[PDB]
Amino acid sequence: EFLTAVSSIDTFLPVLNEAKLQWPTSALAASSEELLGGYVGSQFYLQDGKYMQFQIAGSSNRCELRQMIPDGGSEIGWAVDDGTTHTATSSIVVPEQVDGVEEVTIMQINSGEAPQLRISWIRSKSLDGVAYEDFIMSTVRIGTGDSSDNFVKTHLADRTAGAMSFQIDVKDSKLTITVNGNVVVNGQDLSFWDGTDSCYFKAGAYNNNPTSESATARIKFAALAWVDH
Ligand SMILES: O=C(O)[C@H]1O[C@@H](O[C@H]2[C@H](O)[C@H](O)[C@H](O[C@H]3[C@H](O)[C@H](O)[C@H](O[C@H]4[C@H](O)[C@H](O)[C@H](O[C@H]5[C@H](O)[C@H](O)[C@H](O[C@H]6[C@H](O)[C@H](O)[C@H](O)O[C@@H]6C(=O)O)O[C@H]5C(=O)O)O[C@@H]4C(=O)O)O[C@@H]3C(=O)O)O[C@@H]2C(=O)O)[C@@H](O)[C@@H](O)[C@@H]1O
Numbered sequence: 480e481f482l483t484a485v486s487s488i489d490t491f492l493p494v495l496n497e498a499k500l501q502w503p504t505s506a507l508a509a510s511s512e513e514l515l516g517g518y519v520g521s522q523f524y525l526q527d528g529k530y531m532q533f534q535i536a537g538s539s540n541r542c543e544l545r546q547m548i549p550d551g552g553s554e555i556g557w558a559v560d561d562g563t564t565h566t567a568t569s570s571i572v573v574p575e576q577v578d579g580v581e582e583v584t585i586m587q588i589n590s591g592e593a594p595q596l597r598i599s600w601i602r603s604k605s606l607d608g609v610a611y612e613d614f615i616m617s618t619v620r621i622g623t624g625d626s627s628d629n630f631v632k633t634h635l636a637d638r639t640a641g642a643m644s645f646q647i648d649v650k651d652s653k654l655t656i657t658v659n660g661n662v663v664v665n666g667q668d669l670s671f672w673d674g675t676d677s678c679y680f681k682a683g684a685y686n687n688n689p690t691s692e693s694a695t696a697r698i699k700f701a702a703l704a705w706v707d708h
């Protein structure tokens with residue numbers, strides 16, 4: 480069937496003007512100019528006339544937008560302590576994921592060193608001794624090591640059938656995440672990352688630890704924007 484390009488409507492043009500698409504790995508799939516120019520494929524198309532839909536199969540593969548300097552610029556890098564407020568907003572519909580998909584990262588703050596933040600859908604996970612299922616989680620790094628003390632993981636919300644709003648705010652070395660209008664991470668310390676000048680937003684679908692290499696993660700965005708005030 481005919482695949483409609485995300486750029487065929489106005490809703491996502493502001494973010495497409497500030498993003499490249501990485502697919503099926505971190506390799507460039509489409510520059511900002513190509514995205515604005517109607518790039519489209521099964522991995523990245525306008526679903527039901529209104530959703531920017533990302534699809535990807537395979538371990539650690541992705542179909543993800545990566546924040547760029549606007550108007551055809553190169554990769555952006557900012558700092559948690561640069562004094563600017565860095566904000567990403569979205570409205571996301573996470574459908575029920577097919578068998579074999581276990582975790583899908585849908586928004587991030589990443590840098591040249593490590594991910595400061597991942598917001599992910601996760602099928603099943605115990606957090607602080609409590610089992611949660613089919614939910615949206617934040618994983619914040621407060622270190623570069625691999626032991627659990629390097630992470631703060633939070634149950635943000637159970638997955639809903641309908642769209643769920645997100646706002647990620649970074650200001651003065653602190654992180655706030657608001658989900659459906661309510662703060663769920665309230666001023667998390669990011670000062671471990673002071674001086675890291677290579678941070679940037681991402682959003683889309685990044686497939687983490689699937690149990691089938693052919694199972695396709697699928698995530699729909701009704702809205703996505705990133706801004707610096
Ligand atoms: O579950 C567990 O076992 C544990 O997992 C933990 O969480 C981890 C998580 O599961 C996941 O593995 C995650 O991976 C990160 C990690 O940093 C990866 O290395 C990778 O990082 C990407 C990055 O996102 C970005 O795409 C980057 O892009 C670069 C790259 O150079 C690329 O080739 C391209 O180069 C460009 C340049 O821009 C250049 O300027 C010019 O443009 O030319 C080249 C070009 O054209 O090729 O773009 C670059 C860019 O845009 O910056 O490439 C990275 C990569 O190596 O692929 O992705 C992951 C991510 O996206 O987050 O790491 C998690 C972790 O370690 O924290 C925890 O949950 C733990 O609790 C748990 O036990």
Ligand SMILES: O=C(O)[C@H]1O[C@@H](O[C@H]2[C@H](O)[C@H](O)[C@H](O[C@H]3[C@H](O)[C@H](O)[C@H](O[C@H]4[C@H](O)[C@H](O)[C@H](O)O[C@@H]4C(=O)O)O[C@@H]3C(=O)O)O[C@@H]2C(=O)O)[C@@H](O)[C@@H](O)[C@@H]1O
Pocket residue numbers: 521526527532534572574640641642699
């Ligand atoms: O199998 C193929 O040939 C292609 O399938 C493509 O994925 C499909 C899915 O398999 C589903 O059929 C999906 O259904 C959509 C509905 O069309 C509808 O948009 C629905 O909208 C929801 C909304 O998301 C929200 O939850 C709201 O609250 O309720 C709405 C509602 O109830 O209508 O959401 C469904 C969904 O997203 O699951 O449509 C997709 C599709 O892309 O059209 C794809 O895998 C493609 O590569 C295959 O070729």
